[PDB]
Amino acid sequence: KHYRGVRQRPWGKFAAEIRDPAKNGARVWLGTFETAEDAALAYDRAAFRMRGSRALLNFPLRV
Asked: What cystine pairs are annotated?
């Protein structure tokens, strides 16, 4: 699978990052993870805070 924001690694990791255009067009790397599900859940948090409420995440339901 390819979560929208999780970049699986060739070593068995997953970087959870979200795009932040409100920050002068900068990047927001939440942090690497052990699986795409862990980096995906973390992306949801940074995708709900940056988008306030109602946003598009990998898991649109279980926060």
From this structure: none
